[PDB]
Every structure is written in structure tokens, then in C-alpha cells.
Amino acid sequence: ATHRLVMVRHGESTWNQENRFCGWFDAELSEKGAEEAKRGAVAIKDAKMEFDICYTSVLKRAIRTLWTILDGTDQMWLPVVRTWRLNERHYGGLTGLNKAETAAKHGEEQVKIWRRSFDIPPPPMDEKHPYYTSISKERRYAGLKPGELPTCESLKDTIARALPFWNEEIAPQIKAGKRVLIAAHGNSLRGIVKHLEGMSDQAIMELNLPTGIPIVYELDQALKPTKPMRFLGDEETVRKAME
């Protein structure tokens, strides 16, 4: 082990409470999610963990989680890089629907196929979708090269657009000795975990990363983990996450 990497999945959003697919909808943290971020900040501060550079998405539930960590650890001065490549999976036409609405519109067996599939995408977000203008036409995506803006993503698609950011931007920083923090989303972090651990498609779909709980990796010089991921927090919080 040579390098320490820390990742955090943001806590609960307002739409997670409504069992509503958020995806690229820019949902706010709930009060519970903000408290989870503060808990993770305390754990990082207590462990005396310093960072040198931070990465997040363009979605405020992740950015706010990062901000809470930086505030609570007195690291507000650190460089922060945002990228759409760390965004949550794009749920396509399912964006904004709850579980019952999704099932009524698309079929229970069909929705089960999508939920359990690594590589079958949900339906596209088309120009008639209520959130099309506010997502697909939003100026924060205007710099994407033609062909990069998704209408929908399978998990395979999400991972395929996240990994290039890891390889080209994050990994060289780690190799230079920088201590990285990544505050992002379950499915984008899954892409990094899958790569670090060399996991199968099935294995990554069985991993539900705990929320607001910092995840610590120790990596060798080739960025290969030398031991299992560890969670930071109070004993009880950590024991639960280990389950």
C-alpha cells in the first residue's frame, strides 16, 4: 500500500423519499442526507485525513455533500473538480416517475428486467418528456462532444463514461502522491470500484455502497487495492455498513 483514496456516496435526496427515479434530475439533499454528510465529515476529521484534490459530479446532492465534508474538516481551500462523468446513472424516460408510475407505464416484468440488467438501458428521454428541457437542454452539458450526451444509460453505459475520467484525470493525481476525495453517486462510484477490484458485472450489481459513509481504499503503486475497502465512522454505523 502506497496511496489512500476516499470516496463518499451522497446521502438521501428529496426524491429518494418519494421512490422517484432522479438520475440527472438535480434533486436536493434531504435533511437526513445533509446529516449523513455531516456525519461523514466528522469521521474524516476524527481520522485526521487530509486531502489534496476533490472530485464531484455536476449534481448538487453530491456537490453539497462535498461542501459539507470540506467545511467540517476545515479543507474549504482545496481544489475541486466537477464532471458530468461522475453523475448518477441517466434513467432516461423513467426520470421523475415513482415505482408505481414506472410499473403502470412500462410493465412489472419489464421493469424487473431493467432493474436486474447490467446492459439493457431504460427507455430514452425524448423531447416530450417533462424533464427533457431541464436536463437534455441544460447548459451544463453544452460542452459535451456530440454523441456524449445520453438519452438513457444502462449501468454498463454509466461505467463506460465514468472510467475515462478516472483513467485520464484522477489516476495520474494519485500516482503523483495526491490524496484524493471523490464525492459522487452510487452508480458512478460503482464504476470505480469495479475497476479497482476487477469485479464482474454481476458482482458490481450486488454492491450497494453505504450513503454518507466514507469508503477508504489503500492502493499500491499500480493503483491496485492491497486490502478490502473500509468504512469510516462510529462503531455502530460501520458495523451496519459491513452487513
Added chain:
Amino acid sequence: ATHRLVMVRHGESTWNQENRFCGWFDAELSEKGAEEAKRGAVAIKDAKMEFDICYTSVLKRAIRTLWTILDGTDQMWLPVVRTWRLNERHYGGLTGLNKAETAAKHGEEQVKIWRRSFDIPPPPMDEKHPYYTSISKERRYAGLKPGELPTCESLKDTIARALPFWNEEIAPQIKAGKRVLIAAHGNSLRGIVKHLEGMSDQAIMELNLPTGIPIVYELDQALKPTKPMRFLGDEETVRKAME
């Protein structure tokens, strides 16, 4: 006029209430200062002003002002660049002293000379100073080239280390059509104002930029202002600042 630039001086810190020289001491915003930041955010949102990139210092009173603006304008996803070159003036050995303590330690006439001088620095922050380890040895300055870390600064010194950041980093972004926001400190913003307006040393020492109040410049293609700075806010707030 071709380009719009917005700058904001952070609001009141906790030490401004104690009439204590903060400088590079990383003082928090007061409650009043946080409310001023929120007021400025509302004014920017009401004016429908979009930015593409934001600059701030490594001091949390400025960073938090920026964060408040980004939150209040739904621009949390914007790129943010921090630099020590936008820090407040380094007050040297005066850091942490209030007005009476400064006068008792250094002399009333001497302090007046320093207060009214553009180019005479205050005394250096030496290794015996109570804040030496927490400022001069702080890891956020470990990347400065040897010779760049000050022990003290005149206003002339502050401006001389701020302007290179304007010339090399901010100005090319503006010329590419990017809409810049700068959230910083009175004395670092003075350096930019002095340059934009071609002001004398005396004139810049007479300018006390309002706090938390966004300042709007319209610049031609050579980045020369085409009209006087304007303040954003409610009528009454703006009228006061115009005084």
C-alpha cells in the same frame, strides 16, 4: 462593451467585529456576513446573471461567500478555481491584533503611516508570532515557489501578486467569452479595479468596495471598462453603496 465581469467582496468576518487585523488568518463569516452573501446571491439571481467560471481565494470567508452565491443562483455545478493570489492583504505581525493593541505595540503615528501608505509594509510575521505556524507553515501555501510566500505585504505587494493571476488565468477566460465571477477580498479586488480603470495609487486607496454587494463591469474586447462599475441589489442597498 462585449464582456460582463462580476466581482464580490465578502461580508463581515468575526474578526472585523473585533476590529482585529485578519489578513491571512482564516476567519469565518459572521452571521451578518453570511446574510450579506445571501443578499448578493438574490440580486444576481434576480438579474438572471449566468456565470461560466468562478474564482476565489483560499480563505473561507471568501469561499463561503462564493458558495452562498452559487447555491442561491442554482449554479453549484460551475467550475471554481481557488488561488492564494486572491487572498486578502497579509498584515504581517499586525495579524491578530486589534486597533488598541496595534497602537500600543507600534505607535499611533507609525500605525497611521502604515494605514495611509500604498507601499510601506507592516512589520513581518516572524517565527515568534502567535499565528506563524498556522499561516506561514500551513500546507495550503506549500506549493508557492520559494520567495512567493510573504511575511507581510504593503498594498503594492498585494496588487503585485494578484495581477499576474488576472493576466494569466482570468483575462484569457473573459476573452474566450466566459462570464466570470470573482468572490474575493477588498484589497485583492482593488488590484483588479486599479488595473481595469488605470487608477493611481492614491485613487485606489480611496476606494472601499461595498461588502456582499455584486459589482458589475462591462468590458470591451481589450478588457477596458466602457462605463462605471455598477452595483447589484435592491434600490436602497445600491443607493448607499453609490455614496
